[PDB]
């Protein structure tokens, strides 16, 4: 079992010297196995000898009575214990190999012949017990530091010979095999300090809200029902509601929920004999900080869906009795193959149809949507026609897993076309100035998220957030399949990103 | 010993890290009564109420087995002897059997959690946290473990107020099987049960009638005896049917397991499909005589609009039927006679049929005029011409709150439909159509005149033929009022009526039946 | 000193044989003493002797290593140890009394000879050393639960005899004392369990977000800047934007930043020869669930200013061609002798000015505000005529205390009023979701919330939050202050209602 060539290694006794406290632990700790959920992993009948099943590092993230006990001290040191337990009866065969890898080793790919160069043993899937075997501490500095996430002395486990049995129809027979881990005898916390509680260990926890309440992400409008529909585009590139998890905003995506699909800038009104008054905005930022071309392909808020808008503006109107008047304009945002709307540059052209040369004046000028023509769920122009720096397209799904919607309405002006078709964006705005407000470490991949129901307590599906800012939804039906939408969306775990949802 | 060993023996009880705890050693110079608990109760294990649970491949990791709080609701005998006395202390014993084929896989965790921690996710992160056991789903031999009672106050009461230490484990790794063949081996578990060294009641109280531990009883009368709840005539026989719509919202024979009714379920047999009115006879030139009736509680108390969607018993069916009535009628010579009305539910194009604000109307193809005095009078029908097994109009056609639908059913469970049929007045074929509820009225009668109370989510039945003694299927109930029985089947299938439904123990919703 | 009459109280020797674990503590806390920051006082010459100082219950709480280390075990029991510093020099002279009230007493007032008749220590303001005096557990139960605020014994300090002392022009020698507190020898925590974050115990932590992009939270449009003025009205009853910190939602506040001051209704449009197409709401809230005249005033999200201003509906028009189409209407707010506007029977009665009748239909709608019109930052009638239960005004602050104000800008029609006049909230909408989306739990009366800079890092002020759901702000200045708008507001502790702030 436990029989791997490493000399033992010092802790807490080699690193009290030079620290001020050498703090305890709570003595009934060391009696009690917990698993870390990046810890699991289920063998198949088709998986090459080669794959890396688990690869996870020590730390005090192994052991939430650690990963929580580590925010009131400095600095931790010593030695873990850990075991792994297959499941596997005795009809079965093939091997497995763990391996200790060293806290300084370029990362990558390992092949079959790597992984057994290290220290490692070899253990067949058909032993009943745990296989227990320690996770030493070598490290070069005297003892590691609790909010800085430095290398450590890692374990690997590789399937060194393929999985070999006898199936039914259904469903073929996972080997599945779990990871549990320990404080060794010698796992000693440094020095006292007041509990800071946005330590670098907290499940990213989500608001408390039903979706029916969240204030939508592209439209000004509460969100109105969300689905799944595996028809629509299921790769598509949104420039609002683009937050990573770990605190970043992608895309063009405002802070607020106010600023989405409206533009701040200085106007320049003036009179043309043919539309009549036509107005040529130079962006800027809502809050009144001046605009640059940057990476994010236009200012912060700008609308990204193609077709006919038009704008509610206050114009300072120098007439005789109408000195302020709110008034509505025309703006065009698609191609349509002549439009002078640069964005990227901070220049827009919006017009109306008037024959009077009525004289408005310039001035600061927010431009609040009033109704969309003609919607077309793809990229306006954010330059003349040329390319520009935007968003990455949501993805990539695994095969099996579609995107899930927040659907919103929108105002809709037409002639024949009576059902308000409307936009939906990946997460409600209550959810962006959460991430962002938060700046939560990421750990791996994608959350566990998923959906109860608040008073039946009845789940719905499981709903796996892949933390590039959307959700994924495993899914095998033809048409759109649409939720209730007054549950509440609650955090399991961390799970790897190969995690296989249950189909709904 | 079995043969063989291939298999995995965990006979030890799993070092659990969690000092002793005094029982009864803490309520004797508090409790002002001796007592003792009959000494051979401690020598056997013995099933618990809740004694069973199913591993089934479809079942993910994370389903929570069987979540059972430690008291006196652990055996049938401390459950039976906590009638008497007010309040337990002290531990248990528990064992746990699973000894699932030679060719399966997959391993459950046992986790001691502890009193005052919130119910509800326990999700599969946080269930090694506390004092836990791991098991694999072979193990051979009885898993002992045990059950200590952690608390702050000397000894609980035995209303089922206190929060004690539950023991919940949890499919940790799912189970998949091996066998070369179409078929995975779902693991049956059991659980049994026992009171530990020093588990003791306190003080010695009457044996109330209307206790907190009452099992369940089902009345021991055959289906083909009782009388069914959609219609006044007897029952003729249930079976299950997939092809029928298997979400209906029957607003009739719907109580729950403890009594609580749901929609517009009488209490009475003669109640069924039926109203009593104050009537309102008046004649012009078309088809004859109108009654305007308002409705009324059959029993002569006063309608008034509620919750439910119509007046106790209201009949929740769609289609034409006839309606008799003694009215007292001003023509000398004739003056009590018993006529007959029509009245159609559902959509009419002229529909001011609102049950639920308490008007309806019957019409008679009457040449003259049938001078009848307005009276209240009962409604009971005698034949149905368009049937519908759905919701009429109970208000115009606006929204009015009624009983949810007849569910949740589990992937490949069926609803078991108590079959009667009713007179049939039509003019092509000669098949007196079907009508089915989902428990004939005197299960109605029972549940609702006892009180019981539900202890997880439903009751494992059985249906013992008492001619020969052998069983013929394994049917679940929910506490929705509902028999849920595994099938697979596409045609109906028909089972024979002298059965005799008995409860069998409790059970939670993921228990996967035996298919039929 | 510690001289009480009180036996010896046991704890962890008492609730061992009933609890499964008895767990330890890290033994370098009981060597640290630590302040709980509701344990500090200012005696000054004008106290009259009687006044409760210091009111304290024993717990988990008063000890920031136990408030937090209370969030992995189900239950504590066992003694604590506290001190108290009296900082005054040798030429006063006045008693000071600590008094051990027991678990179960009538909260209330004690005059100065029922806090003697208790077990009470008496000493004087001109003691160097720390009073220690015990703080034993007082019981019933064997050990109390910790997500459970339970009663225990309590400190209560009086001031025993007035503070006599001469004092400068400045600033009139306030005699300050502090208390500390250790756990005892025997304060052992009882049942491991896993880390659950939302214990009872967690400082209200602000969103770290800059106040020129929150959402604003009575008008759709982001906050422009944040002021003090004492010469506006310093006792508004606004019904938007209103959260006390422990969750609750007073007055009509919405939960989104998209609902406010605008209404979902069934609309019923219906010609009139005079002013043309008029239209009679019967309100909803937005997200479609019926509305029921309730506690609140209005439906979530009705405006709470008076004045008229117009909406902008989707009217699904029966002309040919102009099938769909989104048209401004006029709605009158104020009371104005005349108008049938009851939003707490819901029914809101907005009219045109159109001459022809063009035929629209009915169904749900969602109206925009688009522009106000003689806005009066008053309640509109709420009912026809009568009152309407409604949110009280903000307040009480203290003397020498102003509301803190949120200013956003808004659209306005006029004819020589040229400086657009506005609207401002007491706290952005991002804080509203907040509050309520943790439902934090509220440990006294105030939080000691601080703006500071966020690169320059030197504050700006001290603003005392209200958990009424306000934040005051000391100041003497007669016209309105202007604040800078792009800082952050953190929190201190919390602190009792009697606090002073720093003058601006």
């Known amino acids: 079992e436990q029989a791997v060539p490493i000399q033992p290694v010092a802790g807490a006794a080699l690193a009290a010297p030079a620290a001020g406290q050498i703090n305890q632990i709570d003595p009934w700790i060391f009696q009690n196995f917990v698993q870390c959920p990046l810890g699991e992993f289920s063998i198949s009948p088709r998986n090459t000898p080669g794959e890396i099943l688990f690869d996870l590092a020590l730390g005090p993230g192994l052991n939430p009575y650690l990963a929580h006990l580590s925010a009131m001290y400095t600095g931790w040191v010593g030695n873990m214990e850990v075991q792994l337990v297959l499941a596997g009866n005795a009809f079965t065969a093939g091997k497995v190999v763990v391996a200790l890898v060293p806290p300084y080793f370029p990362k990558g790919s390992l092949t079959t012949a790597q992984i057994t160069c290290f220290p490692h043993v070899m253990c067949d899937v058909r032993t009943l017990e745990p296989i227990q075997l320690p996770l030493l501490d070598v490290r070069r500095v005297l003892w590691h530091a609790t909010q800085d996430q430095e290398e450590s002395m890692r374990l690997v486990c590789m399937l060194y010979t393929p999985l070999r049995t006898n199936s039914p129809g259904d469903e073929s027979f996972v080997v599945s095999g779990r990871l549990l881990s320990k404080p060794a005898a010698d796992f000693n916390f440094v020095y006292l300090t007041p509990p800071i509680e946005r330590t670098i260990y907290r499940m990213v926890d989500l608001p408390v809200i039903q979706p029916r309440l969240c204030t939508h992400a592209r439209w000004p409008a509460p969100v109105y ?139 600061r000028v ?22 520009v720096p935007l968003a990455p397209p949501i ?31 990946a997460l409600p705005q209550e959810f962006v100035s959460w991430f962002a407000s938060n700046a939560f470490t990421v750990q791996s991949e994608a959350l566990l998220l998923r959906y109860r129901n608040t008073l039946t307590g009845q789940l ?45």
Chains 1, 3 share one sequence.
Not at 371 to 378: E, K, R, V
Not at 398 to 425: H, K, N, S
Request: negative net charge; proline residues 7%.
């Open 395 to 425: 993805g990539p799904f695994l095969p099996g897993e579609v995107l899930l919607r927040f659907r919103t309405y929108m105002r809709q002006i037409d002639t024949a076309d009576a059902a308000a078709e409307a936009i939906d964006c």
């Open 225 to 363: 029902g969300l689905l799944v529909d595996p028809s629509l585009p299921s790769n598509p590139q949104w420039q609002n509601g683009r937050v990573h998890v770990d605190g970043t905003l992608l895309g063009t995506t405002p802070i607020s929920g106010s600023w989405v699909s409206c533009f701040a800038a200085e106007a320049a009104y003036k009179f043309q004999s043919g539309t009549g008054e036509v107005a040529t905005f130079t962006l800027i930022e809502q809050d009144g900080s001046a605009y640059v071309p940057g990476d994010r392909a236009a200012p912060l808020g700008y609308p990204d869906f193609s077709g006919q808008l038009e704008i509610e503006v206050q114009t300072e109107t120098t007439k005789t009795g109408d000195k302020l008047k709110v008034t509505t304009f025309e703006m065009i945002l698609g191609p349509t193959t002549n439009a002078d709307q640069a964005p990227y540059q901070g220049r827009v052209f919006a017009s109306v149809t008037a024959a009077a040369s009525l004289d408005l004046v310039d001035g």
């Open 460 to 504: 719905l599906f499981e709903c796996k957030l892949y933390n590039e800012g959307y959700i994924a939804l495993s899914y095998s039906g033809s048409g759109p399949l649409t939720f209730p939408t007054d549950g509440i969306f609650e955090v399991v775990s961390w799970v790897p990103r190969l995690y296989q949802l249950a189909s709904v």
């Open 366 to 387: 927010r431009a609040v949507p009033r109704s969309i023509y003609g919607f077309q769920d793809t990229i306006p122009e954010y330059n003349d026609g040329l390319l």
